[model samples]
Target chain A: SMIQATFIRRKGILESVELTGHAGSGEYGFDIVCAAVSTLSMNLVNALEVLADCTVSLQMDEFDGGYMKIDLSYITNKSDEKVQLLFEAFLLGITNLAENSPEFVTAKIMTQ
Target chain B: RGSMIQATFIRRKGILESVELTGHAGSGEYGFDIVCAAVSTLSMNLVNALEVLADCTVSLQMDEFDGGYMKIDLSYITNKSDEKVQLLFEAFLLGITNLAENSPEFVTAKIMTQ
Candidate 1:
């Protein structure tokens, strides 16, 4: 399996970022595809968790080692530019990752 | 197209830790690629050794579909005490790295710090 990451913006706010798909055929521990996504997403969540008071809820499905859904419906400061920049930076990281392995991960935008 | 270098860093209270194993063998099939299978074997074994045997959480990643890429973060454990985890990391790295020497064109492993 490959990787699938989705970013959604609801009518008036950034809603969520969801990542699914496996790391391909390899050992569970050393799967770079999975690891890359994990690092990318985890780092983002870490930043969001610490830097901005963004409410993030993540549920991971570890069965095949590929799934993360981050729900950020509320931010204490809606006008915080740091959060917006961090979100963009996160997207940039994913975009670069996608460019590195087109067949491995897909980043999509959905209007919610 | 077999050259791959991976780095795994180890730090003790925010300082550097030295080398571990240096090496590998048959796994799966030939056409299935023994080198790759060996990597997977070594890595999973490493993760399990630390995560399963020793109680710890490791952030793991791999991109085998694209010639392999992986990183495991251990900063969170900077405060936790786990000698076995460090021991397992050393061993895993030593084995894979030694394997690299045998087939330098196929591997380069690195152990990095968070």
Candidate 2:
């Protein structure tokens, strides 16, 4: 089976991201495809268990572009002033790959 | 004092991910038996996780099982923290739990402090 999931982006950020994996698909190798979505669920659940206290959202789709579209979301409240810190932390986590990678592109941020 | 921890993970819901392997010394031991059962389990999990991450599934033969064990050599890819590492560890434990009808002796893991 192909790994299919979706990543959602909030805060009115526009970005387009591409996922690349190993070319051939016979033996055990990499073959990933990622896209920016409007929601995060499955991936978010997976991330929460793995990345505690982090504020961010991500969704995963299939290679064909139509999966359940998993989403991950995190936010900070006034009570937890540190929430922004978590968002910053989550941003830092992807910045390296998203910024450095030539394949990633910034989409237009829209007002919600 | 000693306690047993068992974990089981379902590969695409039906396939077995990992099996029950005994872990002594609890949650941060340096060395333990990979056990043939564990070897099979780990190999399956590694392959499945990799495939899932890659978005494709592949098959492999269980050439050897008894020699298998979760070694410290393999590190978590997402984050470098005990919490992150523990998730993977727990996932593996869950895989073991799903396989055997009864729980195993124990399930413990520890990463390098440095």
Candidate 3:
């Protein structure tokens, strides 16, 4: 299945993201496209948890690793731009993937 | 505490134009090291963001066999792109600086501008 992702923005700020499906570019453990998405997604979560005081919620396929979602509406440090920048970076990466591999990935942005 | 990693961010005429990373964090085995993982994420994400978000061009040279070496060079594009790149670049630096501050034994990050 092709990878699908939706990013939700509120008042010009990215607030949530949901990703589903698989890149299936290669065998299960060796998909380069999946690897890219996993790295970018995990990094965003890790950075948000450690570096910025942002409230983040996450859910994923426990064993199979195909679905994931991240919500960041309860950010604790609105005074700082770190969280926003990180989100921007993540969006940019996913959007890039969608652009480069339209057959393998799809990304959509929803504004609120 | 483990082996040290060094990261240098280079700026030309106040615009961040290059970044170099060397040495292994050695905090854990290659695939299990959080320090390495964090740094890797920051490094890769930086390049992708610059290209995709900032709409700029960059060149990357990496050590594929020996491990723990990376150099990235940036090229001029536009004012808007450059500005976006600057923000993303500083964000990358901030992540590295945080690692250096919290795990002094494993990370060293510095900036050079001319």
Q: Which candidate ranks first by DockQ, i.e. highest?
A: 3
- Better model by lDDT: candidate 1 vs candidate 3: 3
The residue pairs found clashing in candidate 3 are: none
Q: Please give the fraction of native interface contacts (Cα pairs under 8 Å between A and B) kept by each candidate.
A: 0.00, 0.00, 0.21
lDDT of 1 by residue, A34-94 (tens): 5556545655565565655565677776667467888766555534654554555456556
Q: What is the TM-score of each candidate against the true structure?
A: 0.46, 0.26, 0.58
- Tens digits of per-residue lDDT for model 2 on A1-112? 1322112345533122222221213222111212111111222233334434443344434434333421233234312323322222223323322333324322222233
lDDT of each: 0.56, 0.30, 0.71
**DockQ for each model:** 0.02, 0.02, 0.19
- Weakest lDDT window of 10 consecutive positions for candidate 2 chain A: A30-39
**Cα RMSD for predicted model 1:** 13.1
What tens digits encode model 3's per-residue C-alpha lDDT throughout B1-114? 346778898877877777788764333443325456557666877888777667776788887434478887774445523566677776677777776787677678889887
True contacts kept of 2: 0.00
Clashes of 1: 30
Candidate 2 lDDT over B16-105, as tens digits, reads 233323332123221122222233434344344433332333334332233222332223233323332334434344333332322244
What total of clashing residue pairs does each candidate reach? 30, 33, 0
- What is the lDDT, from 0 to 100, of the residue B52 in candidate 1? 50
